[PDB]
Amino acid sequence: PILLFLIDTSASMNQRSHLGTTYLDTAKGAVETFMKLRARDPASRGDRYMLVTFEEPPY
Amino acid sequence: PQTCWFEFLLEESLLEKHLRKPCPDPAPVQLIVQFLEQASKPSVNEQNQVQPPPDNKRNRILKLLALKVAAHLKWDLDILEKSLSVPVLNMLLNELLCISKVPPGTKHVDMDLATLPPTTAMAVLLYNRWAIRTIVQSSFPVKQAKPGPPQLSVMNQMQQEKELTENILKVLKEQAADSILVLEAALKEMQCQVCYDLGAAYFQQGSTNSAVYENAREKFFRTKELIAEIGSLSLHCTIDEKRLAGYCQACDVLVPSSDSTSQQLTPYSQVHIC
Amino acid sequence: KSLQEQNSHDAMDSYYDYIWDVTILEYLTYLHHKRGETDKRQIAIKAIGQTELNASNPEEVLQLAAQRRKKKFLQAMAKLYF
Amino acid sequence: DEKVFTKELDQWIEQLNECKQLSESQVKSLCEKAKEILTKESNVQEVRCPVTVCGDVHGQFHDLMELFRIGGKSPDTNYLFMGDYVDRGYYSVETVTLLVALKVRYRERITILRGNHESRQITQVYGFYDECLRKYGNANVWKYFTDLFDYLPLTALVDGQIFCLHGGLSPSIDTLDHIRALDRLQEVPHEGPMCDLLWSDPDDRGGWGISPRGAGYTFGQDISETFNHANGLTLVSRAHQLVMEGYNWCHDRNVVTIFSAPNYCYRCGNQAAIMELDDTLKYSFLQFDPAPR
Amino acid sequence: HCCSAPGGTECGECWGAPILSPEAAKAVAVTLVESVCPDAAGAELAWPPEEHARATVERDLRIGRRFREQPLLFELLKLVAAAPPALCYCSVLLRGLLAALLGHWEASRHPDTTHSPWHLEASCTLVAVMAEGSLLPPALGNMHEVFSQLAPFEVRLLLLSVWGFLREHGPLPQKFIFQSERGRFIRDFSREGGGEGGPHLAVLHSVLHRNIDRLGLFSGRFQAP
Amino acid sequence: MSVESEQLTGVPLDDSAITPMCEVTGGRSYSVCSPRMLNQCLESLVQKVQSGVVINFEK
Ligand SMILES: [Mn+2]
Ligand SMILES: [Mn+2]
């Protein structure tokens, strides 16, 4: 199925957890883990992945 | 040349030849470790059921070979303790007591040392001294080696042997006083060693109660007198004079025996008393 | 409405340390990036990234931090005038 | 005593120059001595210029001999090899023996960093243990060299400007004081600041990200820039990623990836590079391709 | 002069020194805290467990560096120790210094401790200042005398025991009982349940008894707590 | 670092202006506080990846 990822891009996420890493980078890592896990499903081939950012279009 | 326990299991004089070698490879303590490990290996039944190793003829041969090596070493508690683990020492001492024909389970204090044969007497004395020294070393704070990343295979054995060591330590603590009573009677070179062990045990115990310090002081003074009497001819007594001197200073801080000149005149102890 | 105008007279950069609300700093970062002022955009990013404030603490530390920054700001502000 | 031992060490050096590994007893005596000679260096073992930085080796003895041919003999040109010199090579034992022998012979004409591959776990499953067992039969030398590998420093500082470390930066670490406070007498843990230092790497991303290696992280342009500002460093030098030019700049002249093991695994065929800084901190570069065999 | 309230009572005949102002000590402690480390993440006056220091190492290291650079802070700390209650407020600085010393002592391969000169003095001063500040029984106050003649791990485990004891007995403004006879607030030991070191004094005794080789003369101090 | 040990066996719902929209469109918005339960949420998403029709049922 269609997979879309709307990632917040405002400065707010630039905070850092006790891991010393930003919320944005944690989000990217979580997305990567998600795609890794989904790859285990044979139906993965039918998946199309999308990214969207909070910035004003066309970007 | 490397010779494992199988050679000595098959042939007995091989042990004699190895101990006669000026450089026995492996070292005798390593031989003890290997033999007792083989003896203590648990028995797995066909149903994958773990059970204590049956005491077969091979097991008895291993045990008596280890005991022969220990006798050749002359039962140097320093060497055995430093080079061998607490469970190993405990089981080896128990086996030595058993081969001494001592009825297992009988409390040591119940038997008169003089009545027993000299070998059994020294065996019981060595067992009690080892128990006291084990308690003292357990009380000693020991630096912990830097932990590596988890190794699930080795940590199993490490934790298992640590638990067994803790159980042995608590067992020894439960009977520590009885060992003191036995050693007190046994005191009537080996006498100096026993007296020093008793003094150290008394000092450790009196860490809480100051009364035991007087007994420790008397023991340490008798130990130094024994050192003076024996002289340099100590072939089995190996005790540092500096530690007992410190013990005597600490106890004299408690008991003033007059004779200020003979006793410390340092401004330090003088300010202590002042 | 106040941060928007360009006629500041109050050492606009050095004061970013005292501000302790994440949202206004988000506004500041957006404004600086849009107007093309990276030397201050980085300062704003650092101020946000500071661990003291995260908008998710048990608030025991957040209130203390806000109190401390208030003290520092009002102390400097009092030093400036008179 | 010391004099006769020095001459004896000279014989070991010349012999190792002939690809002939030492005896097991000699290896034991070498490791024992090396413990006392490495115990005295903190994590950031500062080294004064001039210097010749050398990247990854992976124990390729012919390549190392050609590298000596190029840069110069060890007593003359000071060297700062960076890690990973024990694995994926058919002469790894000889290479590591030569490196440690040079270090012990000369305390300050050379300095060796600790790469990711110098640990107990990695060597067992990446050849070095097998090589040692095949050559010396037993594992006594293996348990000597693996023990030695912990006493190595972690990073080097050249005239307070260049920062040489194998892997790269790490989200936990921020300042040289933290590196100095880190304790090294520990087999590289699988997760932690020490772990990442040996598995970090550059990337054109920004922020951070999990490394595909499974350990450490991946830093971005802005991270390196911020770290350099934080501590006045002007250039970081790492060598963990295989390259082609041998030396490659990244993060707009902030991190130099060096690699001094040409034709990686005998098949990549990549050239190899070596950097050298003169007394006035005047960097240069040399390149080479493995000697005929 | 500034902190000491004149009082005017002329304590004693001519010997009794005037007591210092707890409020002045409070002000000094707070301003010193803000000067050194404006951080307040670990402002909970209750001491967290040892593992918690692992996350706070970086701040701990910067505090340690600042101290090494500026020795005057030790004298200010002694001045604050003069007043009983100010230390409870000056809790984060001490936690940071202790974390730094613990971390440093671990990475000490030298068999002797005196090899690292400054750290030894810093540890001694820390322990003595705590003793004078009365967050430790005098038994543990004697602790600092023996640091010189000890292996590194010995001192590290010893300071870990100190950490444990203080964790049990969290410094708080309460338990500093005011005395009408003398303004100086008193913390009455043995009324906190734990009282003396107990388990921790056992560790101390075990250390000194293991190191009777050169500590016999010093052993006469601790006696029986 | 969260000294609290998270014994929760589920993913508690979050309180944000998005949450009503998430419920309206048929999704369970997730709040996270540690990497472990983040991974729990992640695997929850992977399992939730399916094909269906969202219908409003009414008695
Ligand atoms: Mn490599
Ligand atoms: Mn590497």
Swiss-Prot record, chain A:
Q: Where in the cell is it found?
A: Nucleus; Chromosome
What is the designated name of this protein? Integrator complex subunit 6
Physiological role: Component of the integrator complex, a multiprotein complex that terminates RNA polymerase II (Pol II) transcription in the promoter-proximal region of genes.
Q: Which family does it belong to?
A: Belongs to the Integrator subunit 6 family.
- Subunit structure, briefly? Component of the Integrator complex, composed of core subunits INTS1, INTS2, INTS3, INTS4, INTS5, INTS6, INTS7, INTS8, INTS9/RC74, INTS10, INTS11/CPSF3L, INTS12, INTS13, INTS14 and INTS15. The core complex associates with protein phosphatase 2A subunits PPP2CA and PPP2R1A, to form the Integrator-PP2A (INTAC) complex.
Source species, domain of life? Eukaryota
Q: In which tissues is it expressed?
A: Widely expressed. Expressed in heart, brain, placenta, lung, liver, skeletal muscle, kidney and pancreas.
Induction, as annotated:
Frequently down-regulated in nonsmall cell lung carcinomas and prostate cancers. Down-regulation in prostate cancer is due to CpG hypermethylation of its promoter. However, some involvement in cancer is unclear.
Give the gene name.
INTS6
UniProtKB/Swiss-Prot annotation, chain B:
TPR repeats: from-to residues: 192-230
Q: Which residues form a coiled coil?
A: none
Q: Where is this motif: WFEF motif?
A: 5-10
As for subcellular location, the record says: Nucleus; Chromosome
According to the UniProt record, one GO cellular component term is: integrator complex
Q: Which GO terms describe its biological process?
A: protein localization to chromatin; regulation of transcription elongation by RNA polymerase II; RNA polymerase II transcription initiation surveillance; snRNA 3'-end processing; snRNA processing
Keyword field: Chromosome, Disease variant, Intellectual disability, Nucleus, Phosphoprotein, Repeat, TPR repeat
Lineage, top-rank taxon, reads: Eukaryota
In the record's own words, the domains note is:
The WFEF motif is required for the recruitment of protein phosphatase 2A (PP2A) to transcription pause-release checkpoint.
Question: What pathology does the entry list?
Answer: Neurodevelopmental disorder with cerebellar hypoplasia and spasticity: An autosomal recessive neurodevelopmental disorder characterized by global developmental delay, profound intellectual disability, seizures, absent speech, spasticity, facial and limb dysmorphism, and subtle structural brain abnormalities including cerebellar hypoplasia.
What is the role of this chain? Component of the integrator complex, a multiprotein complex that terminates RNA polymerase II (Pol II) transcription in the promoter-proximal region of genes.
- Protein family: Belongs to the Integrator subunit 8 family.
What protein is this chain from? Integrator complex subunit 8
Q: Which organism is it from?
A: Homo sapiens (Human)
From Swiss-Prot, chain D:
Cofactor stoichiometry and binding remark: Binds 2 metal ions per subunit. Can be two manganese ions, or one iron ion and one zinc ion.
User: Post-translational modification, briefly?
Assistant: Carboxyl methylation influences the affinity of the catalytic subunit for the different regulatory subunits, thereby modulating the PP2A holoenzyme's substrate specificity, enzyme activity and cellular localization. Phosphorylation of either threonine (by autophosphorylation-activated protein kinase) or tyrosine results in inactivation of the phosphatase. Auto-dephosphorylation has been suggested as a mechanism for reactivation.
Q: What is its EC number?
A: 3.1.3.16
Give me the residues that bind Mn(2+) 1, please.
D56, H58, D84
Q: How is its activity regulated?
A: Inhibited by the interaction between PPP2R2A and ARPP19; this inhibition is enhanced when ARPP19 is phosphorylated. Inhibited by the interaction between PPP2R2A and PABIR1/FAM122A.
Source taxon at top rank: Eukaryota
UniProt xrefs under InterPro entries = Calcineurin-like_PHP_ApaH (IPR004843), Metallo-depent_PP-like (IPR029052), PPA2-like (IPR047129), Ser/Thr-sp_prot-phosphatase (IPR006186)
Which residues are recorded as binding Mn(2+) 2?
Answer: D84, N116, H166, H240
Q: What residues form the catalytic site here?
A: H117 (proton donor)
Q: What class of enzyme is it?
A: hydrolase
Family note: Belongs to the PPP phosphatase family. PP-1 subfamily.
Q: Which PANTHER family match?
A: SERINE/THREONINE-PROTEIN PHOSPHATASE PP2A-RELATED
**By what name is this protein known?**
Serine/threonine-protein phosphatase 2A catalytic subunit alpha isoform
What species was this sequence derived from? Homo sapiens
What lineage, starting at the top, does this entry show? Eukaryota, Metazoa, Chordata, Craniata, Vertebrata
Curated annotation (Swiss-Prot), chain E:
Gene Ontology terms: biological process: regulation of transcription elongation by RNA polymerase II; RNA polymerase II transcription initiation surveillance; snRNA 3'-end processing; snRNA processing
Could you tell me the keywords of this UniProt record? Acetylation, Cytoplasm, Membrane, Nucleus, Phosphoprotein, Transmembrane, Transmembrane helix
Annotated compartments:
Nucleus; Cytoplasm; Nucleus membrane
What is any one of the record's Gene Ontology cellular component terms? membrane
Query: What residue intervals traverse the membrane?
Result: 72-92, 146-166
Query: What is the superkingdom listed in this entry's lineage?
Result: Eukaryota
Major location, coarse class? nucleus
Q: Which family does it belong to?
A: Belongs to the Integrator subunit 5 family.
Complexes and interactors = Component of the Integrator complex, composed of core subunits INTS1, INTS2, INTS3, INTS4, INTS5, INTS6, INTS7, INTS8, INTS9/RC74, INTS10, INTS11/CPSF3L, INTS12, INTS13, INTS14 and INTS15. The core complex associates with protein phosphatase 2A subunits PPP2CA and PPP2R1A, to form the Integrator-PP2A (INTAC) complex.
Q: What does this protein do?
A: Component of the integrator complex, a multiprotein complex that terminates RNA polymerase II (Pol II) transcription in the promoter-proximal region of genes.
User: What is the recorded name of this protein?
Assistant: Integrator complex subunit 5
Q: Which organism is it from?
A: Homo sapiens
Q: Which gene encodes it?
A: INTS5
Of the intact sequence, the residues represented are: 785 to 1009 of 1019
